[PDB]
Amino acid sequence: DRAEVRNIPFKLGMYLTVGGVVNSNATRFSINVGESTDSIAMHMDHRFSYGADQNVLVLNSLVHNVGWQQEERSKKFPFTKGDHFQTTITFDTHTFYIQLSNGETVEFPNRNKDAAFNLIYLAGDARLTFVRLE
Amino acid sequence: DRAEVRNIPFKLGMYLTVGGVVNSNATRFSINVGESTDSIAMHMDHRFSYGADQNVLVLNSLVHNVGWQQEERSKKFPFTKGDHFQTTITFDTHTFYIQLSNGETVEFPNRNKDAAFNLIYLAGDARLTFVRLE
C-alpha cells in the first residue's frame, strides 16, 4: 500500500529521516505524520503538477471526521522527478521542524500540541528507500 | 496493532536495527521479516515462558497457507523482562545474520533465497522504541 512506519512512537525530541525516489511523471506525493490516514498532524505535499499548483510544497493537518484545515505553502522545491530526496523532521509541542535535501528548512505549527505520533507514511507518486527514527 | 515497517524494501546488503523494551511479565515476543503476517521468511521468537520453553530463542519460517517449517533453537538469551534490547539483522541469499544486544550472533538460513522483504514487524509482549533501515 503506502510505505508506513506504524506504532513505533515518534516522540518529542526524536528525529525522523526518510529517503526515497520521486517517480518519473509524478503528479504529487506526501509525507504524513499522525495517528491514522484520516488523522494527520503534519501533511507535507510535494506538488509537481496538481491543479494550478506546479513545483510547490503545501503543508496542512487533517482532522478526523472533520477535514483539512488552513494550508500553508512554500516555494522551496529542490525536488526532481526521477531523483532521490532526503527529509528530516523533528518537533516540539509548538512547531514541526522540517529540513529538505539541500539544507533549506520549513517550519509548520504543531496545531494540536501533540507530543507523540504513531503513524508515519508516504503516499502518492514516490517510494521510500530508507528510514531512521531514533 | 503490532509495531510494523511496511513497504520500505529491506534488500540484500541493507541493515535493520530495532530497539525496544520487553514487557514485565512477558511470555514471548517475536521479530518477523517477510511479506505478510502469514508469509514470514525469518521469525525470531524470544520465549521467557512458553509451554516447556523458558529463556530460549526459536527461529523458523512461515509459509503462506502452509504453516511453520522446521524450528531452530538457540540457547543464547541475553534478554530481561522490563529491560531494553537492540538487534541488528542483515542477510544475503543464503543466510540471515542476526546480532544480539551483547554482541552474540545467530545465523538462520534464508530458506526461500529471497532478496528483498516488504514487511518487518514485532508481535507479542514487547514494544519498539527506534528503528534504522538503511
Swiss-Prot record, chains A, B:
* Binding annotation for a beta-D-galactoside: W68, Q69, Q70, E71, E72, R73, S74
Keywords in UniProt for this one?
A: Acetylation, Lectin
Residues of the Galectin domain: 2-134
Xref: CDD domains: GLECT (cd00070)
Name any one GO molecular function: laminin binding
UniProt key word Membrane? no
Identify the InterPro entries for this entry: ConA-like_dom_sf (IPR013320), Galectin-like (IPR044156), Galectin_CRD (IPR001079)
The answer, when asked if Acetylation is one of the entry's keywords, is yes
Q: Name one GO cellular component term.
A: extracellular space
Q: How does it assemble?
A: Homodimer.
Its biological purpose: This protein binds beta-galactoside. Its physiological function is not yet known.
Q: What is the name attached to this protein's record?
A: Congerin-2
- Protein's organism: Conger myriaster
